[PDB]
Design a binder for this molecule. Structure first.
Ligand SMILES: CC(=O)O[C@H]1[C@H](C)[C@H](O)[C@H](C)[C@@H](O)[C@@H]([C@H](C)OC(=O)C(C)(C)CC(=O)O)CC/C=C(/C)C(=O)Nc2cc(O)c3c4c(c(C)c(O)c3c2O)O[C@](C)(O/C=C/[C@H](O[C@H]2C[C@@H]3OCO[C@@H]3[C@@H](C)O2)[C@H]1C)C4=O
Lengths: 82, 141, 714, 52
């Protein structure tokens, strides 16, 4: 159902909450990954650190925070909860 | 009203007494204060025969101020007015205040000046520093 | 009821100025020997002139006059402060026009017929019972109390102008009074179609209308002035206020209503004021209304309007704002106002004249310079001097200080007043030049503007529909506004519906078509009320006005339109066609003409947006309330909601780098421009100021980490 | 201790007027009397004036 999510509401938070423990863990999850993607796109980030991404097919002008949400939705990355 | 438009009234009754000048609340007081000759026409259909002015009443109750050691004749009476310095348009344009200078005309008898005394316009307003002001009325017991 | 009147409360302030002046004449006459003393030399009039100067300037009773319409200024006068309900309040001072704010009960307006006794007592007029003589009623007349003078004794002017006042609730009646004194003058100034009899009497006495002093005939009629040739032979002339900026910025414009050949009697209206038409208050327009809810665009308070109102400038109003700038007597020397700006393009000053002031008639948008001005320099960067020397520009001092237009406003320049030092004029000490620029705006009605009627109803403009798609009568005549019904079954505001039907009765006329007498609903009616043509104004006094029976009788009589079809039934409803789908609306919808107003709250003034701007000196937080870029306040209540969501970062961003981080808000604007990650916030300046405030209180505070015992912010 | 000046500023207002915090007058109240006390002690003034 929910014929098709539009913009911010995609992906649904229900299908996202299965990838992490809490909604708060979801925030730090996608937020730090957005920092990694936006780094990679500008250029290599901090001292002696090579940053990767994006893993999923990027959108036309898709923001780095919207990409990281699609990455978590597909289980393309795991985090250490706590 | 002579030039009043035609407006059909659903009221079957009659109001004999026309509304008094709603602006008279401001004008009648300031005319009583300065002691205008128009308020002096209130003695034409007279009441109490004496038209004592507000400034005169304040000046008369204090007059004379008697020094304790020796008597001093400081009695003040018959205050004088001068025509208003400038028009309301000039006072609002030049940012000055609409006022008429007032000097008291009263043991030496040397007439003394007091200061610029603000005046009320026909609309019942005061121009104080180029701004049109209205003095509300206060209700105490 | 003391009722301190202006002159009487003026005199009381003169007492203090004279008494404190006499205290000096007692003391300073003793030290100096006699025969060197006169009432003149010893009396210093400063305490007397200071008291009156201190009264109008500092007194709460001396108020900045409120005039966006003649009624507001008329009701600002006659207002009274009650700080020191009952039977004595009836007929003396109505609690009906008390403000809706927390000051309710302390502030009220004088009744219509109230007269003031010389001692301060409020005298109500009445007729002893029904004797024809009118005597002053008061507490003295309350001892022997037996007939009132007239209805609406307890009703003020603002309240007496609401048709069908008896039907609405006291709250809605109160709000209606405040809504009327909030109206803005429209360029057209169309008179109300249905109303009371107070429009005429309140307009002329407001003072903003041109009244004839003596009977005569007009000699000349021009937009500038009007001359009247009296039979007595004397010559009177009246200069008309033309686009004069009011106290609150509403255009005060006077229109001559007479022609040269006309013969005018004394007391007649020669020209209309800003909000008057033909000598009676016109605070709004007459519009065709539909009370059907229309696809949620009029949801809950919102109102939908036809694009016709934007095209025909019916709700358009002129707004004028004054800007000022001054000259020398500065810190490091006297600055000069000049056209020359330090470094700008020739096209930026293209609209500036030889002096550097914006030329009249020119259009100005956000950021454009009005008055060019320079300041004395510090004359004390290396990287800027190099480019200066390379291309030849010089460190000509200077700091650019120009009066630009405030962000978010635009218009045309109507006039400039300049006060220079060369001419001898009066100005403050050291200030050489003073120039004031007046800019006018023709404001179209726009979505978001607040409209209201005389019954207290109010609401923003939800949407402006093109004239093509609107519920329209079978005539093809679209409705101007579309109201909603759901307000009634809690607040009930019945009067709003009554004038809506009478508005249609007056627009289309009527003829009772008497056959074998007159109907029973016309029993209490006069004969002149029958058979009126279209577009006829109507007067319904508050308590002696129309009644429900006569209304429906008029609803049954409707002069058809051009083709002879009847557009409204006896129920005041009609079958409207949806301008979008074309299908007719399944049920008959109530239509009519209601008198609505344009309130002073406008979208152009109430919209604010800020990305970066100036910051306060003591506290490094942003500062709103200046000519540009006001910042929004994030209170603790908002901080409580932000914590309830559990959003720690969002709360930290608002309170540190968006508000108080000295090095934070600059590095974020830098990172955003480069497109980098946003850095971690620092220490808010509010907290650093907190520590110093503690140290100045002799409290030794120390911020200790896990190690390195004490750290100093610096 | 004396609070830094930027937290108790004195700056020129619009139209040429001056503005300042109250702390400057309250600090001025203290330093004025503390100094006059030094003058009284060095003057050998009576104890009534000094203790006052
Ligand atoms: C700058 C100024 O002069 O403001 C004036 C006054 C507001 C202006 O006349 C203003 C133009 C006003 O006429 C219009 C305005 C549009 O209305 C509104 O602002 C709102 C938005 C609320 C209305 C609305 O849109 O809903 C329309 C007003 C219509 C109504 C039913 C109304 O408001 N009634 C009203 C409201 C009041 O609050 C007070 C009030 C007050 C006294 C003694 C009053 O009688 C008040 C009063 O009758 O005592 C207080 C504590 O303080 C007093 C403060 C000020 O007096 C000065 C007088 C001296 O001038 C300089 O030094 C003095 C200075 C220190 O105080 C007040 C009296 C105070 O709160």
């Amino acid at each position: 159902a929910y014929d098709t999510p539009l913009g911010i509401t995609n992906p649904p938070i229900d299908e996202l909450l299965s990838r992490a423990s809490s909604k708060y863990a979801l925030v730090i999850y996608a937020a730090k990954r957005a920092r990694q993607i936006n780094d990679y796109y500008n250029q290599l980030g901090d001292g002696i650190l090579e940053y990767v991404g994006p893993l999923v097919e990027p959108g036309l002008q898709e923001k780095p925070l919207s990409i990281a949400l699609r990455e978590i939705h597909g289980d393309l990355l795991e985090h250490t909860e706590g | 009203v002579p030039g009043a438009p035609n407006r059909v009234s659903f009221a079957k009754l009659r109001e004999p007494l026309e509304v008094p000048g709603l602006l008279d609340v401001q004008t009648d007081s300031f005319e009583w204060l300065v002691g205008s000759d128009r308020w002096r026409q209130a003695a034409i259909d007279r009441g109490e025969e004496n038209p004592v002015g507000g400034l005169e009443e304040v000046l008369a109750e204090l007059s004379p101020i008697e020094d304790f050691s020796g008597s001093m004749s400081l009695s003040f009476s018959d205050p004088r007015f001068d025509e208003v310095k400038a028009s309301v348009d000039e006072c609002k344009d030049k940012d000055m205040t609409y006022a008429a200078p007032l000097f008291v005309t009263a043991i030496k008898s040397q007439t003394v000046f007091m200061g610029d005394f603000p005046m009320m316009t026909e609309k019942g307003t005061f121009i104080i520093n180029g701004t049109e002001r209205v003095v509300v009325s206060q209700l105490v017991r | 009821r003391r009722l301190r009147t202006v002159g009487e409360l003026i005199q009381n302030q003169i007492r203090v100025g004279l008494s404190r002046m006499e205290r000096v004449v007692r003391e300073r006459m003793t030290t100096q020997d006699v025969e060197a003393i006169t009432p003149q030399t010893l009396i210093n009039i400063r305490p007397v002139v200071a008291a009156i100067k201190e009264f109008f300037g500092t007194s709460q009773l001396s108020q900045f006059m409120d005039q966006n319409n003649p009624l507001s200024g008329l009701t600002h006068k006659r207002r009274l402060l009650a700080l020191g309900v009952h039977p004595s309040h009836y007929g003396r001072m109505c609690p009906i026009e008390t403000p809706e704010g927390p000051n309710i009960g302390l502030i009220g307006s004088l009744s219509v017929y109230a007269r003031v006794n010389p001692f301060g007592f409020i005298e109500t007029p009445y007729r002893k019972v029904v004797t024809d003589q009118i005597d002053y009623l008061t507490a003295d007349e309350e001892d022997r109390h037996v007939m009132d003078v007239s209805p609406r004794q307890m009703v003020s002017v603002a309240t007496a102008m609401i048709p069908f006042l008896e039907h609405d609730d006291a709250n809605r009646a109160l709000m209606g009074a405040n809504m009327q004194r909030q109206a803005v003058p429209l360029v057209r100034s169309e008179a109300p179609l249905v109303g009371t009899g107070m429009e005429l009497r309140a307009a002329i006495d407001a003072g903003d209308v041109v009244v004839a002093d003596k009977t005569g005939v007009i000699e000349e009629v021009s937009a500038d002035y009007i001359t009247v040739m009296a039979d007595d032979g004397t010559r009177q002339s009246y200069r008309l206020r033309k686009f004069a900026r009011s106290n609150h910025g509403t255009c005060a414009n006077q229109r001559p209503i007479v022609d040269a050949g006309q013969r005018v009697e004394a007391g007649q209206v020669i020209a209309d004021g800003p909000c008057t038409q033909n000598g009676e208050m016109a605070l709004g327009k007459n519009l065709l209304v539909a009370i059907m809810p229309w696809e949620g665009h009029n949801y809950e308070d919102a109102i939908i309007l036809s694009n016709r109102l934007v095209e025909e400038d019916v709700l358009t109003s002129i707004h004028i704002e004054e800007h000022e700038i001054d000259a020398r007597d500065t810190k490091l020397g006297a600055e000069e106002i000049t056209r020359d700006i330090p470094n700008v393009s020739d096209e930026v000053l293209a609209d500036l004249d030889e002096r550097g002031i914006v030329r009249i008639g020119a259009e100005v948008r956000d950021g454009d310079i009005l008055v060019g001005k320079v300041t004395p320099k510090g004359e004390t960067t290396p990287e800027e001097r190099l480019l200066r020397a390379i291309f030849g520009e010089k460190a000509r001092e200077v700091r650019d200080t120009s009066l630009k237009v405030p962000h978010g406003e635009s218009g045309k320049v109507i006039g400039i007043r300049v006060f220079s030092r060369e001419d001898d004029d009066e100005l403050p000490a050291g200030v050489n030049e003073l120039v004031r620029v007046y800019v006018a705006q023709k404001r179209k009605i726009s979505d978001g503007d607040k409209l209201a009627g005389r019954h207290g109803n109010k609401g923003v403009i939800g949407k402006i529909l093109p004239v093509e798609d609107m519920p329209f009568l079978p005539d093809g005549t679209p409705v101007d506004i579309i109201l909603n019904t759901h307000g009634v079954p809690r607040r009930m505001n019945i009067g709003q519906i009554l004038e809506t039907h009478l508005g249609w009765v007056a627009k289309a006329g009527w003829n009772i078509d008497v056959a074998a007498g007159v109907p029973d609903w016309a029993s209490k009616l006069p004969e002149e009320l029958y058979s009126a043509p279209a577009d006829s104004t109507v007067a319904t006094p508050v308590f002696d006005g129309a009644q429900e029976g006569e209304l429906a009788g008029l609803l049954g009589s409707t002069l058809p339109n051009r083709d002879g079809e009847v557009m409204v039934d006896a129920d005041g409803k009609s079958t409207l066609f949806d301008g979008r789908s074309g299908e007719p609306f399944p049920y008959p919808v109530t239509v009519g003409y209601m008198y609505i107003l344009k309130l002073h709250h406008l979208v152009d003034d109430k919209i604010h947006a800020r990305s970066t701007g100036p910051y306060s000196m003591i506290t490094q937080q942003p500062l709103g309330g200046k000519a540009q870029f006001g910042g929004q306040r994030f209170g603790e209540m908002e901080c409580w909601a932000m914590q309830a969501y559990g959003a720690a970062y969002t709360l930290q961003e608002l309170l540190t780098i968006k508000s108080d981080d000295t090095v934070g808000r600059v590095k974020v604007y830098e990172a955003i421009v480069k497109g980098e990650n946003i850095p971690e916030p620092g220490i808010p300046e509010s907290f650093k100021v907190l520590l110093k405030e503690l140290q100045s209180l002799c409290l030794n505070v120390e911020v200790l980490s896990s190690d390195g015992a004490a750290i100093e912010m610096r | 201790p004396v609070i830094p000046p930027e937290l108790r500023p004195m700056v020129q207002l619009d139209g040429g007027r001056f503005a300042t915090s109250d702390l400057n007058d309250l600090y001025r109240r203290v330093i004025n009397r503390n100094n006059r006390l030094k003058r009284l002690i060095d003057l050998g003034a009576p104890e009534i004036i000094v203790n006052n």
